[PDB]
Design a protein around this nucleic acid. Structure first.
Ligand SMILES: [Mg+2]
Ligand SMILES: [Mg+2]
Ligand SMILES: [Mg+2]
Ligand SMILES: [Mg+2]
Ligand SMILES: [Mg+2]
Ligand SMILES: [Mg+2]
Ligand SMILES: [Mg+2]
Ligand SMILES: [Mg+2]
Ligand SMILES: [Mg+2]
Ligand SMILES: [Mg+2]
Ligand SMILES: [Mg+2]
Ligand SMILES: [Mg+2]
Ligand SMILES: [Mg+2]
Ligand SMILES: [Mg+2]
Ligand SMILES: [Mg+2]
Ligand SMILES: [Mg+2]
Ligand SMILES: [Mg+2]
Ligand SMILES: [Mg+2]
Ligand SMILES: [Mg+2]
Ligand SMILES: [Mg+2]
Ligand SMILES: [Mg+2]
Ligand SMILES: [Mg+2]
Ligand SMILES: [Mg+2]
Ligand SMILES: [Mg+2]
Ligand SMILES: [Mg+2]
Ligand SMILES: [Mg+2]
Ligand SMILES: [Mg+2]
Ligand SMILES: [Mg+2]
Ligand SMILES: [Mg+2]
Ligand SMILES: [Mg+2]
Ligand SMILES: [Mg+2]
Ligand SMILES: [Mg+2]
Ligand SMILES: [Mg+2]
Ligand SMILES: [Mg+2]
Ligand SMILES: [Mg+2]
Ligand SMILES: [Mg+2]
Ligand SMILES: [Mg+2]
Ligand SMILES: [Mg+2]
Ligand SMILES: [Mg+2]
Ligand SMILES: [Mg+2]
Ligand SMILES: [Mg+2]
Ligand SMILES: [Mg+2]
Ligand SMILES: [Mg+2]
Ligand SMILES: [Mg+2]
Ligand SMILES: [Mg+2]
Ligand SMILES: [Mg+2]
Ligand SMILES: [Mg+2]
Ligand SMILES: [Mg+2]
Ligand SMILES: [Mg+2]
Ligand SMILES: [Mg+2]
Ligand SMILES: [Mg+2]
Ligand SMILES: [Mg+2]
Ligand SMILES: [Mg+2]
Ligand SMILES: [Mg+2]
Ligand SMILES: [Mg+2]
Ligand SMILES: [Mg+2]
Ligand SMILES: [Mg+2]
Ligand SMILES: [Mg+2]
Ligand SMILES: [Mg+2]
Ligand SMILES: [Mg+2]
Ligand SMILES: [Mg+2]
Ligand SMILES: [Mg+2]
Ligand SMILES: [Mg+2]
Ligand SMILES: [Mg+2]
Ligand SMILES: [Mg+2]
Ligand SMILES: [Mg+2]
Ligand SMILES: [Mg+2]
Ligand SMILES: [Mg+2]
Ligand SMILES: [Mg+2]
Ligand SMILES: [Mg+2]
Ligand SMILES: [Mg+2]
Ligand SMILES: [Mg+2]
Ligand SMILES: [Mg+2]
Ligand SMILES: [Mg+2]
Ligand SMILES: [Mg+2]
Ligand SMILES: [Mg+2]
Ligand SMILES: [Mg+2]
Ligand SMILES: [Mg+2]
Ligand SMILES: [Mg+2]
Ligand SMILES: [Mg+2]
Ligand SMILES: [Mg+2]
Ligand SMILES: [Mg+2]
Ligand SMILES: [Mg+2]
Ligand SMILES: [Mg+2]
Ligand SMILES: [Mg+2]
Ligand SMILES: [Mg+2]
Ligand SMILES: [Mg+2]
Ligand SMILES: [Mg+2]
Ligand SMILES: [Mg+2]
Ligand SMILES: [Mg+2]
Ligand SMILES: [Mg+2]
Ligand SMILES: [Mg+2]
Ligand SMILES: [Mg+2]
Ligand SMILES: [Mg+2]
Ligand SMILES: [Mg+2]
Ligand SMILES: [Mg+2]
Ligand SMILES: [Mg+2]
Ligand SMILES: [Mg+2]
Ligand SMILES: [Mg+2]
Ligand SMILES: [Mg+2]
Ligand SMILES: [Mg+2]
Ligand SMILES: [Mg+2]
Ligand SMILES: [Mg+2]
Ligand SMILES: [Mg+2]
Ligand SMILES: [Mg+2]
Ligand SMILES: [Mg+2]
Ligand SMILES: [Mg+2]
Ligand SMILES: [Mg+2]
Ligand SMILES: [Mg+2]
Ligand SMILES: [Mg+2]
Ligand SMILES: [Mg+2]
Ligand SMILES: [Mg+2]
Ligand SMILES: [Mg+2]
Ligand SMILES: [Mg+2]
Ligand SMILES: [Mg+2]
Ligand SMILES: [Mg+2]
Ligand SMILES: [Mg+2]
Ligand SMILES: [Mg+2]
Ligand SMILES: [Mg+2]
Ligand SMILES: [Mg+2]
Ligand SMILES: [Mg+2]
Ligand SMILES: [Mg+2]
Ligand SMILES: [Mg+2]
Ligand SMILES: [Mg+2]
Ligand SMILES: [Mg+2]
Ligand SMILES: [Mg+2]
Ligand SMILES: [Mg+2]
Ligand SMILES: [Mg+2]
Ligand SMILES: [Mg+2]
Ligand SMILES: [Mg+2]
Ligand SMILES: [Mg+2]
Ligand SMILES: [Mg+2]
Ligand SMILES: [Mg+2]
Ligand SMILES: [Mg+2]
Ligand SMILES: [Mg+2]
Ligand SMILES: [Mg+2]
Ligand SMILES: [Mg+2]
Ligand SMILES: [Mg+2]
Ligand SMILES: [Mg+2]
Ligand SMILES: [Mg+2]
Ligand SMILES: [Mg+2]
Ligand SMILES: [Mg+2]
Ligand SMILES: [Mg+2]
Ligand SMILES: [Mg+2]
Ligand SMILES: [Mg+2]
Ligand SMILES: [Mg+2]
Ligand SMILES: [Mg+2]
Ligand SMILES: [Mg+2]
Ligand SMILES: [Mg+2]
Ligand SMILES: [Mg+2]
Ligand SMILES: [Mg+2]
Ligand SMILES: [Mg+2]
Ligand SMILES: [Mg+2]
Ligand SMILES: [Mg+2]
Ligand SMILES: [Mg+2]
Ligand SMILES: [Mg+2]
Ligand SMILES: [Mg+2]
Ligand SMILES: [Mg+2]
Ligand SMILES: [Mg+2]
Ligand SMILES: [Mg+2]
Ligand SMILES: [Zn+2]
Lengths: 79, 49, 96
RNA sequence: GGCGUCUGGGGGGAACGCGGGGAAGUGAAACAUCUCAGUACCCGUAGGAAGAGAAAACAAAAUGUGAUUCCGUGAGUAGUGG
RNA sequence: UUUGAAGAAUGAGCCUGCGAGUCAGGGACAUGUCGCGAGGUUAACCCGGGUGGGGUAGCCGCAGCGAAAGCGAGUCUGAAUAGGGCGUAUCCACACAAGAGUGUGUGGUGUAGUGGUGUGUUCUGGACCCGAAGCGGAGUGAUCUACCCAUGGCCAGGGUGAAGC
RNA sequence: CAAACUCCGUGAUAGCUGGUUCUCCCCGAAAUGCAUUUAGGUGCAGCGUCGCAUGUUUCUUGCCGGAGGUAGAGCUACUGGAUGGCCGAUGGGCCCCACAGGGUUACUGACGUCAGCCAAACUCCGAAUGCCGGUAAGUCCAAGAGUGCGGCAGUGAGACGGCGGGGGAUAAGCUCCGUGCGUCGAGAGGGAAACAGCCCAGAUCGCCGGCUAAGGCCCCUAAGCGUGUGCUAAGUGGAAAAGGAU
RNA sequence: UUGUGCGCCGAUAAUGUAGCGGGGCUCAAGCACACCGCCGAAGCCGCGGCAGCCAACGUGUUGGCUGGGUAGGGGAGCGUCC
RNA sequence: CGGUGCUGGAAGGUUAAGAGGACCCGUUAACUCCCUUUGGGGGUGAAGCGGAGAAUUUAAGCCCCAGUAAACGGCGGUGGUAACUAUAACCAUCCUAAGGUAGCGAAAUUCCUUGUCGGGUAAGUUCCGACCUGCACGAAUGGCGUAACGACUUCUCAACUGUC
RNA sequence: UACAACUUGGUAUUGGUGCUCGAUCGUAUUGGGCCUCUAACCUCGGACCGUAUAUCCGGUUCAGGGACAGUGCCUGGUGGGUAGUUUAACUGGGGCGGUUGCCUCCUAAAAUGUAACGGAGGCGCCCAAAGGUUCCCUCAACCUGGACGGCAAUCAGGUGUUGAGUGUAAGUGCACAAGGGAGCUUGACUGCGAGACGGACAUGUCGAGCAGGGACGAAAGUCGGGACUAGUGAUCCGGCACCUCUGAGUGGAAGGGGUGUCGCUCAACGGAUAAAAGGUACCCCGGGGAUAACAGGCUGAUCUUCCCCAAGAGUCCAUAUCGACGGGAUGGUUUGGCACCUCGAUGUCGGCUCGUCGCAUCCUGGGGCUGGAGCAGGUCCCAAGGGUUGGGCUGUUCGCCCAUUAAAGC
RNA sequence: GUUACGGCGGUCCAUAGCGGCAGGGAAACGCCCGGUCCCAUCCCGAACCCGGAAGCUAAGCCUGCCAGCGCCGAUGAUACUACCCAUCCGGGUGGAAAAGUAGGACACCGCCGAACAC
């Protein structure tokens, strides 16, 4: 008797990485989703691998529109 | 070898600038492409070698 | 730990070392002016007495500093920076 | 070849020096190249020292060094090395 | 030593003496601390039956960048003000931008390393202490045993009865 | 004697085993990941320490903004899986095959619909928790809180118990994981007789003082052979089930 | 019939009761429910002592805290020979 | 006689050192455009020098052809196939070189296994004698018998006895 | 991986003639092959001498060989004869199996991460377009059939919301398309890169903007490879191309140098070497209960022994005696799992002697019921006082056999 | 201001969808008439595009009504769980689902542009 199973993969460590209401800076990554679990919003970039980030300082803001999930950044007021 | 190894050269330059792989079985005709190589500073077709 | 050590899993830095070197030293134009309250010419022996280079050392320097006092120069290989510094100071920096 | 006669040498000695020969344990985390090292050890010489010693050497335009030997540097640098 | 031992796991019969992180190197670094300070310091060596004096030969930092040519408070990259990498010790006040977090220009505060001495670590040395099976070189052995070589000695008594005659 | 003996290289080499000597004061680990001719070794990062620097940036809670996709639940919602019913033309088909009447014959019956479960690789649903981000109060004669840099070594053999689990048979004091789990390790004290890991609780020192936690109060043994209300006849208490019994 | 709390049988090991720790316990010293108590540690408090860190003031006192500890790190010492 | 060896045959293919000099490469006199006046700045390449550098000659051997087993070594499985009964004693399959002949055979080899049967005993997993379904005998790493021999192995019998 | 030995040729100890064979049938190519000869060389043939004695040796003569042989040096073969070595780890003891990197999901406890020889599947590519962009458009399910033609081929009418699909597995996504078709064409650009994600580390991922040029679209804009997640390899050594790098003293050149780029199922996939198999019962050393073999221990799958419901067997009758399909327990004895104690030592099966205990009792003792006429049984309950064969066979425990007893207990 | 009009838009995008029923052509909307010229059918003026308004609102769209189906959704309870417990054995406080149930429900709203009125 011998087993043919027992192999696996690495652990990419996906998942949202900057949470709602946080303060992020330009070029900052937001999520790492295999599929399009989310959707870009104003000031959000669609990465080469379905990754989400920010193209301008501000506070990230989730929100559901038309029954999907889309990320967006509200520029925090300049002090 | 399933996927040979091909280099590409400019004409005025003649510098092994671009290298790419192909299926020689299905492409017996040589590869032609229009591209850029930096030093002569402008686009120019690259040949195969 | 047997694993490929760092000092052995990185590629050698290219290019040679050109053992043949006629190398020199720069004594700042600012330091020279600070040393010359009255100024005047500058010679190898004088800068040795000033202790800013090896006494036998042959010198190539730069014009990082400004020259306001008339200071003629007795030098071998200048820098254009200190050359213009001397010229604006209204002296000479001749290259021997 | 055979005699006979004068003069030498014959062996011992702790190290050093020269010269002929010359390995493995070990490190390389194994191991052959490699290292250990021309080390231990063996052998033949002389001496109080020996050995080396008067460039067929270096250097680099200076119209420079000037036999050999031993120190401190230069420097763990240029380099050599599965 | 162990996750763990009153341990029925190991070591110790007892006593007394002996017994184990030392030592060298312009070796390297950091911390103390000592002298001088854009300087710090000398080796070998010479001469004082005495540690003095001389000796700057040399090494480290004062400037870094670049593999190198070379450049130089910049430099490399690059076709490039066009920012980035590495330094410009480090900061204060004034102006220009976006306020992509900070960058870009002025006037001052102006750069701190080096050689001892002791200390931890690393370094090559046997390097905290004892310990092996074993490999190699030089020599000593066949007075036991193995074999063989030459010369001597040993095998009481009693039966069986080939060839030959 | 599976390569004689003495000397020498020889302090051969030993990731292996043993041992490592005077006192006190301060802080205080891990048995993890990754990699490894690596698994009983070693190095890197976490974990400690000392110093320097930023001096609260850290911590706890409250409130706010958040994304989940677990427990659970559900399925005429899908992928699967399942029982029982309904017309069932048409088994998408049969006693004579007429090109036309009936399982005139008990079958099959598809679809769908009525309802009832199940799933780690099902989710038309979906929490308490945990985490990250912002604000505010508090310990703020300092934890001796954090982060960076610098000198220093340990450790990378874990155990047990509670939680959620894989494997095992829901067996092991079993093995393998997660616990900003706990404890032992590296922890003395009291309780469970004895018993590290279970319960209570952190040993600066001394006192022939007092109050208490867990656990106990008839005697061994300190504490009520207490108060009131009920149950038990079995020494049940002071080892156990399916089932059985005026 | 039903829901119930207690009970009983169901119940066999090996050196010696040995399945409350033991004696003993039902005229419970058992079980369930409440109360008041009291014992019970190196926990806390009480008194005296030492030491570390910290803040204030001073030219070492006051006050707040902490002080178990292996590998290991840091600090300060005792003693022996010369 | 396939493999490995050894023995003969070297006609062919491959290959040593050693010789070697085609190509390619370096250098340099002359030059080659224009500049001065008394060769270099915008490429050729002189002879030699040298660098890598040729092809060409090469023996044994290996590849190749035979022999050789008292050289090392092997000697099969598959199916069909009778006058009652189970057989193969005959034919077809593959493949290798062949596929175990005489002799013996649950033995020093037989795992089931104490095979089955008979002898010896009341009883015999040991023994002896046979059968052959030889897991996994076998003919010079020898087969079969063999008189005698043996401090050899197994077994039985009479005497023998304190082994009991 | 070599080396001793054996074997070849060239080269030297190296001489000559005759012949026969070659590239500038009557002109030229210097070496190969053969036959000779003495003179190098050998002679372990002879005979003299050193010698008065000498089988060594040296010299002399002659005799045989003779350019061979032998010997060196280079080289090729063969080369366990000799020598230095290698022969992995993971492992629920080792060995044999299987795996060794990468990718998807679950286990994973709703941030990440999170092991196991746990459950399940794939990768070591493909692609000049399957890339970029512009534009058009969207299915499958569906009733009917001028005939083939059918359950399904192509269809249009007119419910039609992914149930069809999307290069290679699964998950995540995807109709605003990441799905097809076409047109065009190369951005599968060049140099940088604000900042981030992940990384112990080397690495690995994402990315707006800046300069040249180009691509699609009038433009808006998008374009730094494929919908994403696998399709991979460090360092050294070397090869190749370009440069405004150096250049061992003059130039230089050469010599070295950069940017670009190739050479590994180095898969044991962070790669000990360019170069690797086995026994040791002839063994040896340092270690471990970190890890097995016996025992002890924990556990109770299996075992054995109980028990529960009750169909049928038993002339009919469940329970005289058996009990189908099932279920619940006990003991720790068999086969087992774990590795907690012992590897600076816990001696192992049988036999002998000696025993000691429990009771699920073998006889002896007392009872209940019988499908108990009696005798003789069967079964269950109480009971551990006592007793409980000998031989043949094999090492046997066991077991069969023979023959006894009340029995020949577990 | 009204409207039984058309575009663009919103919204933790179905209380907003689907189904049946009825009604609209003044303008606008659809269908519509024909393909010389633009342009297209991997054929077709089906799609698109273009010229014109003869006709009609059947289809589609819109609006109004219907609870047939989707759909939202209480309070309450139950499941669940953070922390703590008592010698297992489940309770104490905190948090509080899913499904089902009463019910709700045949979208609302913004800016412009068209026909009646000022
Ligand atoms: Mg995964
Ligand atoms: Mg390129
Ligand atoms: Mg002498
Ligand atoms: Mg080594
Ligand atoms: Mg090693
Ligand atoms: Mg060596
Ligand atoms: Mg050497
Ligand atoms: Mg003399
Ligand atoms: Mg001399
Ligand atoms: Mg030197
Ligand atoms: Mg321990
Ligand atoms: Mg202990
Ligand atoms: Mg004892
Ligand atoms: Mg012990
Ligand atoms: Mg012991
Ligand atoms: Mg031990
Ligand atoms: Mg002892
Ligand atoms: Mg003694
Ligand atoms: Mg040092
Ligand atoms: Mg210092
Ligand atoms: Mg100083
Ligand atoms: Mg002096
Ligand atoms: Mg440099
Ligand atoms: Mg560049
Ligand atoms: Mg710049
Ligand atoms: Mg000192
Ligand atoms: Mg030796
Ligand atoms: Mg002798
Ligand atoms: Mg006769
Ligand atoms: Mg001896
Ligand atoms: Mg010695
Ligand atoms: Mg040595
Ligand atoms: Mg030693
Ligand atoms: Mg060592
Ligand atoms: Mg030990
Ligand atoms: Mg502490
Ligand atoms: Mg603060
Ligand atoms: Mg929430
Ligand atoms: Mg949510
Ligand atoms: Mg569930
Ligand atoms: Mg349900
Ligand atoms: Mg479905
Ligand atoms: Mg139901
Ligand atoms: Mg689920
Ligand atoms: Mg999902
Ligand atoms: Mg979680
Ligand atoms: Mg927050
Ligand atoms: Mg404090
Ligand atoms: Mg530090
Ligand atoms: Mg350390
Ligand atoms: Mg380890
Ligand atoms: Mg471990
Ligand atoms: Mg472990
Ligand atoms: Mg663990
Ligand atoms: Mg355990
Ligand atoms: Mg735990
Ligand atoms: Mg558990
Ligand atoms: Mg374990
Ligand atoms: Mg503690
Ligand atoms: Mg304790
Ligand atoms: Mg106690
Ligand atoms: Mg205390
Ligand atoms: Mg007592
Ligand atoms: Mg009392
Ligand atoms: Mg009381
Ligand atoms: Mg009372
Ligand atoms: Mg009462
Ligand atoms: Mg009891
Ligand atoms: Mg009971
Ligand atoms: Mg009952
Ligand atoms: Mg009742
Ligand atoms: Mg009873
Ligand atoms: Mg009691
Ligand atoms: Mg009290
Ligand atoms: Mg007390
Ligand atoms: Mg206290
Ligand atoms: Mg105080
Ligand atoms: Mg302490
Ligand atoms: Mg420990
Ligand atoms: Mg310590
Ligand atoms: Mg004293
Ligand atoms: Mg033949
Ligand atoms: Mg042959
Ligand atoms: Mg063969
Ligand atoms: Mg030629
Ligand atoms: Mg051959
Ligand atoms: Mg052959
Ligand atoms: Mg036999
Ligand atoms: Mg026989
Ligand atoms: Mg036999
Ligand atoms: Mg047998
Ligand atoms: Mg038999
Ligand atoms: Mg017998
Ligand atoms: Mg047989
Ligand atoms: Mg055989
Ligand atoms: Mg034969
Ligand atoms: Mg034979
Ligand atoms: Mg043989
Ligand atoms: Mg024989
Ligand atoms: Mg015979
Ligand atoms: Mg007898
Ligand atoms: Mg007798
Ligand atoms: Mg030759
Ligand atoms: Mg010759
Ligand atoms: Mg060989
Ligand atoms: Mg060998
Ligand atoms: Mg060796
Ligand atoms: Mg292993
Ligand atoms: Mg195991
Ligand atoms: Mg095994
Ligand atoms: Mg997760
Ligand atoms: Mg782990
Ligand atoms: Mg596979
Ligand atoms: Mg395309
Ligand atoms: Mg149609
Ligand atoms: Mg596409
Ligand atoms: Mg498509
Ligand atoms: Mg950056
Ligand atoms: Mg541009
Ligand atoms: Mg771009
Ligand atoms: Mg791409
Ligand atoms: Mg792409
Ligand atoms: Mg290499
Ligand atoms: Mg020169
Ligand atoms: Mg030159
Ligand atoms: Mg070059
Ligand atoms: Mg690997
Ligand atoms: Mg490796
Ligand atoms: Mg290598
Ligand atoms: Mg051991
Ligand atoms: Mg052991
Ligand atoms: Mg141990
Ligand atoms: Mg242990
Ligand atoms: Mg045993
Ligand atoms: Mg055992
Ligand atoms: Mg034991
Ligand atoms: Mg058990
Ligand atoms: Mg009956
Ligand atoms: Mg019954
Ligand atoms: Mg163990
Ligand atoms: Mg133990
Ligand atoms: Mg032991
Ligand atoms: Mg022993
Ligand atoms: Mg024993
Ligand atoms: Mg035994
Ligand atoms: Mg009984
Ligand atoms: Mg009876
Ligand atoms: Mg009976
Ligand atoms: Mg009995
Ligand atoms: Mg009795
Ligand atoms: Mg009209
Ligand atoms: Mg038309
Ligand atoms: Mg209509
Ligand atoms: Mg319509
Ligand atoms: Mg709904
Ligand atoms: Mg609706
Ligand atoms: Mg509510
Ligand atoms: Mg609690
Ligand atoms: Mg309980
Ligand atoms: Mg609800
Ligand atoms: Zn070009």
């Amino acid at each position: 008797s011998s087993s043919r199973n027992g192999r696996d993969s690495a652990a990419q460590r996906l998942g949202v990485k900057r949470f709602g209401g946080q303060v992020v800076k330009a070029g900052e990554i937001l999520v790492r989703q295999r599929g399009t679990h989310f959707h870009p919003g104003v000031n959000v970039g669609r990465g080469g691998d379905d990754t989400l980030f920010a193209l301008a300082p501000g506070a990230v803001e989730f929100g559901a529109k038309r029954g999907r999930k889309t990320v967006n950044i509200v520029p925090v007021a300049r002090p | 070898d399933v996927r040979p190894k091909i280099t590409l050269a400019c004409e005025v330059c003649k510098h092994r600038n671009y290298i790419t792989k192909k299926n020689r079985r299905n492409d017996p005709d040589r590869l032609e492409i229009k591209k850029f190589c930096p030093n002569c500073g402008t686009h120019q077709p690259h040949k195969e070698s | 730990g047997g694993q490929m050590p760092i000092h052995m899993r990185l590629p050698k830095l290219k290019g040679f070392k050109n053992r043949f070197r006629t190398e020199y030293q720069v004594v700042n134009v600012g330091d020279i002016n600070k040393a010359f309250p009255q100024g005047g010419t500058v010679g190898v022996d004088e800068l040795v007495a000033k202790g800013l280079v090896r006494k036998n050392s042959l010198v190539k320097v730069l014009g990082d500093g400004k020259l306001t006092v008339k200071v003629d120069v007795t030098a071998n290989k200048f820098s254009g920076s200190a050359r213009e510094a001397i010229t604006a100071a209204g002296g000479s920096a001749t290259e021997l």
